[PDB]
Structure 1
Amino acid sequence: SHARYRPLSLRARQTLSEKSDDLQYHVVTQEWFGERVDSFLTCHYPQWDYETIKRLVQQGHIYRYRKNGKKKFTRLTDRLEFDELLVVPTRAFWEKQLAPPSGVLEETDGPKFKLSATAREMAHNMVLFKNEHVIVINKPHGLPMMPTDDPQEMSIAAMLPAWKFTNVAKPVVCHNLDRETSGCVVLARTRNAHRMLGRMFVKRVVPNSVYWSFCVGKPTVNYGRVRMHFDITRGNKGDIIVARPSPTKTSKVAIAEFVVNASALEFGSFISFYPLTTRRHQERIMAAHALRCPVLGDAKYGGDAAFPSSLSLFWDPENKGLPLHLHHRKIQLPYKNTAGEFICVTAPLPTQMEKTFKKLGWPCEVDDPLIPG
């Protein structure tokens, strides 16, 4: 970490590129007259990947100077010209307060973890939908998605090498989930597939996810649209989340569409959330405060109303270890099947939620027509 990168506007990046001196000006002799820029670069730099050269050329870090006083930016398909220069940054060019692209540097994997056959069998059981581009797994309850403070505690981010059935590298998780969430997690096989699928998980207007939850109590309306602005602040032992109805310069909005599927005597209810944003504990806090009816098992947000005397008939209120009823039921994918409908994968409920639904008489396996596919 000899160079600490800093935010830079386009003006500042141009100014630094002009001020720098760690450049290499390749001339174009008669031998290289008329060669493409990408071919020139791939023949001159054998250690640079083709995608890295593409990113450099299309971002403009490798431009050309046609002796006209100004620098000329070209794409990969452009042909070169005699007597002109091609400017290429060197290794020391990225040592200033200018952040380089991903491929130009070398990223070391370092230490790798060795997995056991039982863990590999568990991962192969978690695998639900396998494709040459995407892999959908069913994340169990109470499992850390990313390595937590305790380095000896297991996590899903280190189970990646066991999922690459034929790929040269481990898949990359597209979106992270809460430790208590028992939904489906999507992994991208191809490094390009991750970039292509990363656009789906940004804030959107049309939902493509389903969250099945069991809240304590019945809300007023059967269907509605929840919206609240969150403020996350750093504290002594953790984070503080402030919820507001009104916007704020620092607030981040959170929007979802909730539908009440069934009501168990107004003491418990089953609801389906369809989110439009991505915020920490978003739907949990929504059900806790907006709907005014916390989900069964959310001790961190309204632990007193989490385990109610009403449902005490079925579960022991003194244990307080029942799984949080938060399941990413159904999620859509841009990929189509042979029929033409988009592939929407569905994860089965954990055995504890199945037991709860059986004790309540509700069917455990039902399709969700709100999100088609």
Structure 2
Amino acid sequence: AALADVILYEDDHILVLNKPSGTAVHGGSGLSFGVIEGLRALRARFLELVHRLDRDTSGVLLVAKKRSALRSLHEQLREKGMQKDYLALVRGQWQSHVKSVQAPLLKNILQSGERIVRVSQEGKPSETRFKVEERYAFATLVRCSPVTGRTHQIRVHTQYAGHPIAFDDRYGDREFDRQLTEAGTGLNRLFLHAAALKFTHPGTGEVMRIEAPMDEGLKRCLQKLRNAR
């Protein structure tokens, strides 16, 4: 209920999914599959992920169905001619003057294929923009716009700022997650959601904006905290 809602947009050029939290976008290092292999298994044709969301993130996921479309979309990403807005629920009260984090990032890949990313002044130049959406008693909903698209960039930028994401197992704060559980939110996954993607359609050249609803769990969490105080 409903499988049809996974599909946000499709034509001959692109396919745009509302990726569920918990589902990997492709297979891991060993015996595993994700969204992209699942989709190829329904078809010889061209299909390629334009970008990635991590396993626990949900929301807007763009897949190219033509080489010309990947060509165009790669180039938009490179030239920062995409806007991806995410919503994150973060610890404490995000400060209004903190409009960006510019902390450079290093990644290592672990024996499992999983990634751990860290701020290092010797890492890859990275930038996220932030805009407070809603404030709760001990948390904030922030719109997080990665300019660069590094691995776990938002998760590490928010942590680095002093405001890690709710239920982030790698970079989060278990006491913040405890507090969310006692407030009765029911939250049971990383609160990070790719809410909107803006880009140019590679076939018609029109500017498009595609938005993903948050799942019921996220929504109930937020409802619980709005009316909590």
> What's the TM-score bracket when you normalise by the shorter of the two chains?
0.7 to 0.9
Distance 1:343 1:264, change over 3 A: same
- In 2, the alpha carbon distance for the partners of 1:335 and 1:192 equals 11
2:96 corresponds to 1:194: no
2:172 corresponds to 1:302: yes
- SS of aligned partner of 1:196: helix
How many residues were matched structurally?
226
- In 2, the alpha carbon distance for the partners of 1:236 and 1:186 equals 28
Corresponding residue to 2:6 among 108, 118, 126: 126
Give deviations 1:190-248, integer Å, cap 9, x for gaps. 122111211122363x661101011121122255111101122456666553313x4x3
- In 2, the alpha carbon distance for the partners of 1:177 and 1:310 equals 24
Is the contact made by 2:126 and 2:150 (CA closer than 8 Å) also made in structure 1? yes
Distance 1:180 1:203, change over 3 A: farther
- SS of aligned partner of 2:200: strand
Deviation, 1:258, is 0.3
Match of 1:330 in 2: 196
- SS of aligned partner of 1:157: helix
- In 2, the alpha carbon distance for the partners of 1:202 and 1:232 equals 20
CA RMSD of superposed structures (Å): 2.9
Distance 1:357 1:255, change over 3 A: same
Match of 1:286 in 2: 157
Question: Unpaired runs of 5+ in structure 1?
Answer: 1-120, 363-373
Is the contact made by 2:84 and 2:194 (CA closer than 8 Å) also made in structure 1? yes
Please list, as runs of the form range in 1=range in 2, the aligned pairs for 1:212-223 lying within 5 A after superposition: 212-221=87-96, 223=98
Distance 1:211 1:148, change over 3 A: same
Corresponding residue to 2:211 among 331, 346, 355: 346
User: How high is the TM-score relative to the length of structure 1?
Assistant: 0.54
Match of 1:144 in 2: 24
Tell me the amino acid that sits aligned with residue 359 of structure 1.
Answer: K
Q: Percent same amino acid among aligned pairs?
A: 22
- In 2, the alpha carbon distance for the partners of 1:234 and 1:188 equals 26
- In 2, the alpha carbon distance for the partners of 1:324 and 1:157 equals 22
Corresponding residue to 2:133 among 261, 267, 276: 261
Is the contact made by 2:196 and 2:210 (CA closer than 8 Å) also made in structure 1? yes
Tell me the amino acid that sits aligned with residue 144 of structure 2.
Answer: F
- In 2, the alpha carbon distance for the partners of 1:138 and 1:240 equals 25
- In 2, the alpha carbon distance for the partners of 1:282 and 1:298 equals 13
- SS of aligned partner of 1:253: coil
Deviation, 1:333, is 2.1
Distance 1:331 1:154, change over 3 A: same
Deviation, 1:298, is 0.4
Is the contact made by 1:295 and 1:306 (CA closer than 8 Å) also made in structure 2? no
Corresponding residue to 1:161 among 40, 53, 57: 40
Tell me the amino acid that sits aligned with residue 66 of structure 2.
Answer: T
- In 1, the alpha carbon distance for the partners of 2:131 and 2:56 equals 22
- SS of aligned partner of 1:279: coil
Tell me the amino acid that sits aligned with residue 146 of structure 1.
Answer: H
- SS of aligned partner of 2:89: strand
Distance 1:306 1:203, change over 3 A: farther
Distance 1:155 1:306, change over 3 A: farther
Query: Which has the bigger relative contact order, CA under 8 A and spacing at least 6?
Result: 2
Distance 1:224 1:163, change over 3 A: farther
